[PDB]
Short mmCIF file of C-alpha atoms in Angstrom, two decimals:
data_model
loop_
_atom_site.label_atom_id
_atom_site.label_comp_id
_atom_site.label_asym_id
_atom_site.label_seq_id
_atom_site.Cartn_x
_atom_site.Cartn_y
_atom_site.Cartn_z
CA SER L 1 220.84 359.28 39.38
CA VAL L 2 219.94 355.97 39.69
CA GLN L 3 218.36 354.33 36.10
CA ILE L 4 217.26 350.75 36.70
CA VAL L 5 215.26 349.01 33.90
CA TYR L 6 213.83 345.59 34.06
CA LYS L 7 212.43 344.04 30.69
CA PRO L 8 212.89 340.49 31.33
CA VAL L 9 211.51 338.69 28.18
CA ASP L 10 210.03 335.21 28.25
CA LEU L 11 208.98 333.53 25.27
CA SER L 12 209.23 330.04 27.05
CA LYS L 13 207.05 326.88 26.12
CA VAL L 14 206.75 323.73 28.41
CA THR L 15 204.37 321.42 26.52
CA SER L 16 203.51 317.42 26.64
CA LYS L 17 201.95 315.25 24.12
CA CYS L 18 200.61 311.91 25.16
CA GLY L 19 199.28 309.93 22.84
CA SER L 20 196.83 307.50 25.36
CA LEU L 21 197.06 307.25 29.03
CA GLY L 22 195.46 304.88 30.64
CA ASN L 23 194.90 301.03 32.58
CA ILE L 24 196.60 301.99 35.75
CA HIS L 25 195.36 299.91 38.46
CA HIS L 26 196.38 301.05 42.16
CA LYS L 27 195.22 298.65 44.96
CA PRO L 28 196.64 299.28 48.29
CA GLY L 29 195.97 297.19 51.41
CA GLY L 30 194.60 293.71 50.16
CA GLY L 31 196.15 291.93 52.78
CA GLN L 32 194.11 290.80 56.02
CA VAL L 33 195.18 293.00 58.70
CA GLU L 34 194.64 292.03 62.60
CA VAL L 35 195.62 294.26 65.51
CA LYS L 36 194.95 292.35 68.92
CA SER L 37 195.73 294.92 71.89
CA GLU L 38 195.95 293.69 75.49
CA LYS L 39 196.98 295.13 78.95
CA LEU L 40 198.31 298.60 77.68
CA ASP L 41 198.73 301.50 79.77
CA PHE L 42 198.82 305.07 78.18
CA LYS L 43 199.79 308.42 80.04
CA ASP L 44 200.01 310.76 77.09
CA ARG L 45 198.22 311.70 73.77
CA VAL L 46 197.71 308.68 71.36
CA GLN L 47 197.01 308.51 67.57
CA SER L 48 196.23 305.27 65.87
CA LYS L 49 195.64 304.27 62.12
CA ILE L 50 194.50 301.13 61.14
CA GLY L 51 193.64 300.08 57.83
CA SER L 52 193.85 301.69 54.10
CA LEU L 53 194.71 305.62 54.60
CA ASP L 54 195.89 308.58 52.21
CA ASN L 55 196.33 306.60 49.32
CA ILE L 56 196.85 308.48 46.41
CA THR L 57 196.25 307.89 42.55
CA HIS L 58 197.08 311.38 40.68
CA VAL L 59 196.95 310.97 36.84
CA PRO L 60 197.12 314.22 34.93
CA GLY L 61 196.88 314.46 31.26
CA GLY L 62 199.36 317.45 31.75
CA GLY L 63 200.75 318.07 34.80
CA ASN L 64 203.15 320.27 33.72
CA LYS L 65 204.86 323.24 35.89
CA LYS L 66 206.33 326.33 35.43
CA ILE L 67 207.26 328.55 38.37
CA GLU L 68 208.84 332.19 37.60
CA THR L 69 209.75 334.52 40.42
CA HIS L 70 210.78 338.17 39.67
CA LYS L 71 212.11 340.19 42.25
CA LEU L 72 213.44 343.96 42.24
CA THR L 73 214.84 345.28 45.54
CA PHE L 74 216.05 348.55 46.19
CA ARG L 75 217.34 350.15 49.44
CA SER Z 1 225.29 358.10 37.80
CA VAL Z 2 224.20 354.24 38.39
CA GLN Z 3 222.43 352.63 35.45
CA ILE Z 4 221.13 349.44 35.57
CA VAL Z 5 219.56 347.35 32.32
CA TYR Z 6 218.33 343.96 33.09
CA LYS Z 7 217.20 342.42 29.90
CA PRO Z 8 217.57 338.56 29.75
CA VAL Z 9 215.99 336.81 27.09
CA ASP Z 10 214.14 333.36 27.30
CA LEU Z 11 212.97 331.40 24.20
CA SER Z 12 213.53 328.41 26.03
CA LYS Z 13 211.76 324.80 25.35
CA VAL Z 14 210.57 322.41 27.61
CA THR Z 15 208.82 319.07 25.45
CA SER Z 16 207.76 316.23 25.53
CA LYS Z 17 206.27 313.50 23.13
CA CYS Z 18 204.87 310.24 24.30
CA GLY Z 19 203.62 307.79 21.91
CA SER Z 20 201.54 305.75 24.74
CA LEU Z 21 201.60 305.40 28.07
CA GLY Z 22 199.85 303.17 30.38
CA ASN Z 23 199.54 299.51 31.42
CA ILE Z 24 200.61 300.80 35.18
CA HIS Z 25 200.13 298.46 37.94
CA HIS Z 26 200.76 299.41 41.67
CA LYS Z 27 199.83 296.63 43.78
CA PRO Z 28 201.32 297.45 47.76
CA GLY Z 29 200.35 295.45 50.84
CA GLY Z 30 199.28 292.14 49.22
CA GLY Z 31 200.48 290.47 52.35
CA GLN Z 32 198.91 289.46 55.26
CA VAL Z 33 199.66 291.41 58.45
CA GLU Z 34 199.24 290.36 62.18
CA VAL Z 35 200.32 292.72 65.08
CA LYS Z 36 199.68 291.01 68.26
CA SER Z 37 200.57 293.34 71.08
CA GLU Z 38 200.55 292.21 75.01
CA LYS Z 39 201.10 293.99 78.03
CA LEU Z 40 202.87 297.31 77.02
CA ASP Z 41 203.44 300.13 78.81
CA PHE Z 42 203.38 303.88 77.56
CA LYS Z 43 204.44 306.63 79.31
CA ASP Z 44 204.68 309.30 76.27
CA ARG Z 45 203.02 309.64 73.12
CA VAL Z 46 202.56 306.84 70.16
CA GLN Z 47 202.02 306.98 66.72
CA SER Z 48 201.04 303.68 65.24
CA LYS Z 49 200.13 302.92 60.99
CA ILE Z 50 199.44 299.62 60.19
CA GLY Z 51 198.09 298.60 57.06
CA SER Z 52 198.51 300.05 53.58
CA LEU Z 53 199.24 303.81 54.08
CA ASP Z 54 200.03 306.83 51.56
CA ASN Z 55 200.86 304.82 48.42
CA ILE Z 56 201.07 307.14 45.20
CA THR Z 57 200.54 306.04 41.64
CA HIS Z 58 201.53 309.34 39.71
CA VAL Z 59 201.25 309.05 35.97
CA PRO Z 60 201.29 312.73 34.34
CA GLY Z 61 201.29 312.72 30.28
CA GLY Z 62 203.95 315.22 30.50
CA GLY Z 63 205.15 316.38 34.21
CA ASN Z 64 207.82 318.66 32.48
CA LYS Z 65 208.86 321.37 35.06
CA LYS Z 66 210.95 324.59 34.57
CA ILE Z 67 211.69 326.70 37.48
CA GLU Z 68 212.92 330.38 36.71
CA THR Z 69 214.17 333.04 39.47
CA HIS Z 70 215.11 336.34 38.90
CA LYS Z 71 216.49 338.56 41.43
CA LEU Z 72 217.88 342.20 41.03
CA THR Z 73 219.35 343.53 44.13
CA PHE Z 74 220.16 346.80 44.67
CA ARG Z 75 221.82 348.33 47.98
CA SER M 1 229.58 356.04 35.63
CA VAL M 2 228.83 352.77 36.21
CA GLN M 3 226.84 351.40 33.25
CA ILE M 4 225.63 347.65 33.72
CA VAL M 5 223.81 345.97 30.85
CA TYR M 6 222.83 341.76 31.83
CA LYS M 7 221.45 340.52 28.63
CA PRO M 8 221.95 336.61 28.60
CA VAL M 9 220.00 334.55 25.81
CA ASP M 10 218.76 331.28 26.12
CA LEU M 11 217.27 329.46 23.39
CA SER M 12 217.78 325.92 24.90
CA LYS M 13 215.67 323.26 24.32
CA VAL M 14 215.52 320.28 26.96
CA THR M 15 213.50 317.34 24.90
CA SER M 16 212.13 313.76 24.99
CA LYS M 17 210.58 311.86 22.60
CA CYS M 18 209.42 308.28 24.19
CA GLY M 19 207.64 305.32 21.51
CA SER M 20 206.02 303.84 24.27
CA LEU M 21 206.23 303.84 28.45
CA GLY M 22 204.05 301.07 30.18
CA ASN M 23 203.98 297.48 31.55
CA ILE M 24 205.10 299.02 35.02
CA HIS M 25 204.54 296.75 37.93
CA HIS M 26 205.75 298.00 41.88
CA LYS M 27 204.15 295.60 43.99
CA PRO M 28 206.07 295.99 47.64
CA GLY M 29 205.22 294.16 50.54
CA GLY M 30 203.76 290.63 49.35
CA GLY M 31 205.25 289.14 52.38
CA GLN M 32 203.39 288.02 55.69
CA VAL M 33 204.53 290.80 58.72
CA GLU M 34 204.11 289.49 62.46
CA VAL M 35 204.75 291.92 65.26
CA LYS M 36 204.19 290.34 68.40
CA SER M 37 205.18 292.72 71.60
CA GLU M 38 205.21 291.77 75.28
CA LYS M 39 206.12 293.63 78.48
CA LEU M 40 207.58 296.44 76.73
CA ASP M 41 208.15 299.75 78.42
CA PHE M 42 208.36 303.25 77.18
CA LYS M 43 209.19 306.62 79.08
CA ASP M 44 209.30 308.78 75.95
CA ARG M 45 207.93 309.27 72.53
CA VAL M 46 207.17 306.06 70.29
CA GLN M 47 206.70 306.28 66.23
CA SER M 48 205.47 302.39 64.97
CA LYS M 49 204.92 302.16 61.26
CA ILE M 50 204.23 298.56 60.40
CA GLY M 51 202.93 297.29 56.84
CA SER M 52 203.49 298.75 53.28
CA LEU M 53 203.64 302.82 53.56
CA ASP M 54 204.95 305.53 51.55
CA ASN M 55 205.21 303.30 48.05
CA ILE M 56 205.58 305.32 45.25
CA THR M 57 204.92 304.44 41.18
CA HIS M 58 206.23 307.78 39.52
CA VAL M 59 205.59 307.37 35.55
CA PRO M 60 205.88 310.61 33.70
CA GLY M 61 205.51 311.04 30.31
CA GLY M 62 208.57 313.31 29.99
CA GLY M 63 209.51 314.43 33.25
CA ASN M 64 212.36 316.94 31.84
CA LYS M 65 213.52 319.45 34.24
CA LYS M 66 215.08 322.94 33.80
CA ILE M 67 215.81 325.10 36.69
CA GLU M 68 217.37 329.00 35.41
CA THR M 69 218.73 331.56 38.15
CA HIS M 70 219.22 334.68 37.14
CA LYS M 71 220.88 336.84 40.19
CA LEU M 72 222.41 340.51 39.48
CA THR M 73 223.44 342.10 43.11
CA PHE M 74 224.57 345.56 43.19
CA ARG M 75 226.07 347.14 45.91
CA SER S 1 171.56 242.89 18.40
CA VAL S 2 173.28 246.51 17.61
CA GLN S 3 173.79 248.26 21.08
CA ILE S 4 175.68 251.78 20.84
CA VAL S 5 176.29 254.09 23.65
CA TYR S 6 177.71 257.58 22.72
CA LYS S 7 178.30 258.95 25.84
CA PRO S 8 181.23 261.86 25.58
CA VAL S 9 181.40 263.95 28.71
CA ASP S 10 183.29 267.19 28.64
CA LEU S 11 184.22 269.30 31.38
CA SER S 12 186.89 271.31 29.60
CA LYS S 13 187.66 275.36 30.40
CA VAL S 14 188.76 277.80 27.92
CA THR S 15 190.01 280.77 30.00
CA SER S 16 191.53 284.00 29.92
CA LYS S 17 192.76 286.45 32.52
CA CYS S 18 194.14 290.05 31.42
CA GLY S 19 195.38 292.63 33.78
CA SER S 20 194.91 295.42 31.24
CA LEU S 21 194.51 295.62 27.42
CA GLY S 22 195.07 298.67 25.67
CA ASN S 23 197.00 301.74 24.33
CA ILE S 24 196.83 300.15 20.70
CA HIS S 25 197.59 302.33 17.51
CA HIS S 26 196.66 301.21 13.84
CA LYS S 27 197.51 304.04 11.70
CA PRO S 28 197.00 302.83 7.89
CA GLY S 29 197.85 304.69 5.08
CA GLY S 30 199.55 307.79 6.52
CA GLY S 31 201.68 308.14 3.29
CA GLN S 32 200.79 310.12 0.26
CA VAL S 33 199.14 308.17 -2.68
CA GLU S 34 199.35 309.53 -6.01
CA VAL S 35 197.92 307.90 -9.12
CA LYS S 36 198.21 309.95 -12.92
CA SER S 37 196.57 307.32 -15.43
CA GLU S 38 196.80 308.57 -19.09
CA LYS S 39 195.64 306.77 -22.58
CA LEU S 40 194.80 303.60 -20.99
CA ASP S 41 192.51 301.19 -22.84
CA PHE S 42 190.46 298.34 -21.23
CA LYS S 43 188.72 295.58 -23.19
CA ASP S 44 187.12 293.94 -19.69
CA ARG S 45 186.29 294.13 -16.15
CA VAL S 46 188.19 296.80 -14.27
CA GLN S 47 188.37 296.78 -10.64
CA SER S 48 190.01 299.39 -8.67
CA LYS S 49 191.09 300.52 -4.85
CA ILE S 50 192.52 303.36 -3.97
CA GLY S 51 193.68 304.75 -0.80
CA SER S 52 192.93 302.97 2.93
CA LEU S 53 190.84 300.13 2.72
CA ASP S 54 189.50 297.14 4.88
CA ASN S 55 191.85 297.77 7.66
CA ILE S 56 190.91 295.98 10.64
CA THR S 57 191.72 297.11 14.55
CA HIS S 58 190.22 293.88 16.09
CA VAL S 59 191.07 294.01 20.02
CA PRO S 60 188.80 291.24 21.97
CA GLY S 61 188.83 291.04 25.90
CA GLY S 62 188.78 287.32 25.42
CA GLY S 63 188.85 286.22 22.14
CA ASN S 64 188.88 282.52 23.37
CA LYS S 65 187.19 280.07 20.79
CA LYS S 66 185.81 276.66 21.58
CA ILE S 67 184.99 274.03 18.43
CA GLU S 68 183.16 270.98 19.54
CA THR S 69 181.83 268.34 16.39
CA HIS S 70 179.99 264.95 17.28
CA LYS S 71 178.68 263.03 14.89
CA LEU S 72 177.11 259.60 15.04
CA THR S 73 176.95 257.69 11.59
CA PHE S 74 175.02 254.56 11.21
CA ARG S 75 174.71 252.82 7.96
CA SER Q 1 175.80 240.99 19.01
CA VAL Q 2 177.68 244.45 18.18
CA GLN Q 3 178.23 246.35 21.62
CA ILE Q 4 180.22 249.48 21.32
CA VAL Q 5 180.61 251.78 24.14
CA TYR Q 6 182.09 255.78 23.36
CA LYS Q 7 182.70 257.27 26.69
CA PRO Q 8 185.87 259.79 26.26
CA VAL Q 9 186.10 262.27 29.34
CA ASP Q 10 187.55 265.38 28.85
CA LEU Q 11 188.63 267.67 31.91
CA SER Q 12 191.04 269.81 29.91
CA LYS Q 13 192.81 273.27 30.60
CA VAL Q 14 193.15 275.73 27.97
CA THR Q 15 194.05 278.70 30.39
CA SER Q 16 196.17 282.23 29.95
CA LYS Q 17 197.22 284.53 32.42
CA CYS Q 18 198.54 288.12 31.00
CA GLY Q 19 199.76 290.57 34.05
CA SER Q 20 199.43 293.61 31.14
CA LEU Q 21 198.85 293.36 27.14
CA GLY Q 22 199.67 297.06 25.52
CA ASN Q 23 201.10 299.45 23.60
CA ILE Q 24 201.01 297.95 20.30
CA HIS Q 25 201.71 300.72 17.45
CA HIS Q 26 201.13 299.14 13.82
CA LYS Q 27 201.71 301.97 11.42
CA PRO Q 28 201.55 300.37 7.75
CA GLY Q 29 202.29 302.23 4.46
CA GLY Q 30 203.85 305.68 5.73
CA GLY Q 31 206.10 305.79 2.64
CA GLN Q 32 204.82 308.22 0.04
CA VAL Q 33 203.29 305.99 -3.08
CA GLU Q 34 203.52 307.44 -6.74
CA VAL Q 35 201.80 305.14 -9.92
CA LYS Q 36 202.42 306.44 -12.93
CA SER Q 37 200.95 304.69 -16.15
CA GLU Q 38 201.00 305.61 -19.59
CA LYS Q 39 199.81 303.91 -23.21
CA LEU Q 40 198.70 300.57 -21.33
CA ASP Q 41 196.34 298.61 -23.19
CA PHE Q 42 194.06 295.66 -21.54
CA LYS Q 43 192.33 292.97 -23.25
CA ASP Q 44 191.27 291.01 -20.26
CA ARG Q 45 190.13 291.66 -16.76
CA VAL Q 46 192.16 294.12 -14.75
CA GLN Q 47 192.49 293.92 -10.65
CA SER Q 48 194.21 297.02 -9.02
CA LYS Q 49 195.05 297.53 -5.36
CA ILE Q 50 196.90 300.91 -4.71
CA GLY Q 51 197.92 302.15 -1.13
CA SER Q 52 197.24 300.98 2.26
CA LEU Q 53 195.25 297.80 2.33
CA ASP Q 54 193.85 294.78 4.33
CA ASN Q 55 196.25 295.72 7.42
CA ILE Q 56 195.48 293.50 10.85
CA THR Q 57 195.96 294.87 14.23
CA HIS Q 58 194.72 291.71 15.99
CA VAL Q 59 195.30 291.78 19.66
CA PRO Q 60 192.92 289.46 22.27
CA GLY Q 61 193.28 289.18 25.53
CA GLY Q 62 193.50 285.71 25.63
CA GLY Q 63 193.02 283.98 22.00
CA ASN Q 64 193.14 280.25 23.39
CA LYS Q 65 191.68 277.63 21.09
CA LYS Q 66 190.46 274.42 21.77
CA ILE Q 67 189.23 272.17 18.51
CA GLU Q 68 187.46 268.63 19.35
CA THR Q 69 186.43 266.27 17.01
CA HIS Q 70 184.41 263.40 17.80
CA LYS Q 71 183.21 260.83 15.27
CA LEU Q 72 181.68 257.17 15.88
CA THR Q 73 181.03 255.64 11.91
CA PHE Q 74 179.09 252.71 11.88
CA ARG Q 75 178.61 250.45 8.67
CA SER H 1 180.46 238.58 19.87
CA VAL H 2 182.40 241.93 19.61
CA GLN H 3 182.70 244.02 22.62
CA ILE H 4 184.44 247.41 22.28
CA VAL H 5 184.79 250.06 25.23
CA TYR H 6 186.28 253.49 23.81
CA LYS H 7 187.23 255.40 27.48
CA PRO H 8 190.03 257.87 27.01
CA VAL H 9 190.64 260.07 29.85
CA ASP H 10 192.09 263.56 29.69
CA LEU H 11 193.24 265.61 32.11
CA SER H 12 195.44 267.60 30.21
CA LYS H 13 196.44 271.11 30.84
CA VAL H 14 197.72 274.01 28.31
CA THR H 15 198.64 277.31 30.17
CA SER H 16 200.70 280.40 29.73
CA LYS H 17 201.54 282.95 32.56
CA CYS H 18 203.08 286.26 31.18
CA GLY H 19 203.93 288.97 33.45
CA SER H 20 203.63 291.95 31.04
CA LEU H 21 203.22 292.00 27.03
CA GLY H 22 203.71 295.18 25.12
CA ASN H 23 205.66 297.77 23.38
CA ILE H 24 205.31 296.15 19.75
CA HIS H 25 206.18 297.95 16.96
CA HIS H 26 205.54 296.94 13.40
CA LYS H 27 206.15 299.87 10.70
CA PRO H 28 205.85 298.00 6.94
CA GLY H 29 206.13 300.11 4.06
CA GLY H 30 208.03 303.41 5.49
CA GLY H 31 210.12 303.74 2.23
CA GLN H 32 208.73 305.46 -0.96
CA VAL H 33 207.41 303.61 -3.89
CA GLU H 34 207.57 304.77 -7.32
CA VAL H 35 205.66 302.72 -10.09
CA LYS H 36 206.17 304.21 -13.55
CA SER H 37 204.67 302.11 -16.10
CA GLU H 38 205.10 302.71 -20.17
CA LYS H 39 203.88 301.10 -23.53
CA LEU H 40 202.38 297.83 -22.09
CA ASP H 41 200.19 295.43 -23.50
CA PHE H 42 198.49 292.67 -21.23
CA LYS H 43 196.74 289.95 -23.62
CA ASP H 44 195.10 288.47 -20.09
CA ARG H 45 194.14 288.67 -16.61
CA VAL H 46 196.12 291.48 -14.48
CA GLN H 47 196.32 291.88 -10.85
CA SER H 48 198.53 294.74 -9.33
CA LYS H 49 199.09 295.02 -5.66
CA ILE H 50 201.14 298.45 -4.81
CA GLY H 51 201.80 299.61 -1.30
CA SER H 52 201.37 298.34 2.10
CA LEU H 53 199.02 295.29 2.14
CA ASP H 54 197.85 292.43 4.20
CA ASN H 55 200.52 293.30 7.40
CA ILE H 56 199.57 291.58 10.36
CA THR H 57 200.19 292.38 13.74
CA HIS H 58 198.58 289.41 15.83
CA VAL H 59 199.08 289.78 19.32
CA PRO H 60 197.33 287.40 22.03
CA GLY H 61 197.77 287.40 25.75
CA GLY H 62 197.28 283.90 25.59
CA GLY H 63 197.03 281.91 21.83
CA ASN H 64 197.33 278.25 23.47
CA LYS H 65 195.66 275.85 21.25
CA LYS H 66 194.59 272.07 21.80
CA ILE H 67 193.21 270.37 19.01
CA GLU H 68 192.04 267.10 19.81
CA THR H 69 190.66 264.35 17.36
CA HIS H 70 188.78 261.08 18.31
CA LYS H 71 187.49 258.27 15.67
CA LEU H 72 185.90 255.37 15.86
CA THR H 73 185.56 253.42 12.68
CA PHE H 74 183.28 250.11 12.70
CA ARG H 75 183.10 248.01 9.61
#
């Protein structure tokens, strides 16, 4: 007789206190950009990105993360 | 007779206190950028990124992380 | 008769106190960039990144990390 | 013949640049205050101030000051 | 014949540049205060100040000051 | 014939550059204060200040000062 008891207890705390969060300045691509292209031959696929792209300002008040995985495999 | 008892107890704390968080300046790509391209032959795929791209300012009040994995495998 | 008792107890603390966090300046790529390319032959795949890319300013109030793995394997 | 010419020229500049101003915490009188007074005789004027009074948080973006006095006295 | 020419020229500059100003903590009077007064006789004026009073947090972005006095006295 | 020419020229500069100004902690009067007064006779004026008073946190981005006095006295 196989008897399995899976009783994990979790009283965890993931906490953050922040007095003030601010005055954040993200200024990407203030510089001049000049692309002068002449007599260019392309045989296959071309991907071009010019300028200021995919810039992120991520400012969460908390941004606390808890990942918990529970796995009971029986064969 | 196989008898398995899986009772892990977790009273953990992941904590942060911050008096003040601020005055953050991220200024990427203030410089001038000049790309002068002439008589260039391309046979295969081309990927070009010019300027200020994928710059991140990440400012979480906490940013505390708890990863917990539980695995009970029985064969 | 096989009898397994798995009762780990965790009363751990991962803590940080910070009086003030700030005045952070990240200024990448203030310099001028000039790429002059002439008479270049490419047979295979080309990847080009020019300028200020993938620069990170990561400022968490805490940034405390707890990784806990529990594994009970029975064969 | 008295001939007075009063032509002062003022091309002055009083300037300030501030990237960010913030995260200012003024917490006066966090402590407990207990005044136990017994059998006190007062013949003249009494002024009593108890607690947290006249506390100032003054945070100007500039706060630049120019005082200019011009005085031409003739007797 | 009295001939007075008063032509002062002022091309002065009073300037300040500040990248970031912040994370200022003023915490006066965190301590406990206990005043136990018994059998006190006062004949004249009494002024009493108890606790946390007249505390200043002054944080100007500039706070630049120019005082200029011009005085032409003729007798 | 009295002939006075007062032509002072001022091309002065009072300048300050500051990369970052911050993380300033002023904590006066964290200590306990106990005043136990018994059988005190006062004939004249009394001034009493108990606790945390007149504490200053002065943080100017510049705080540059130019004083200029011009005086032409004629008798």
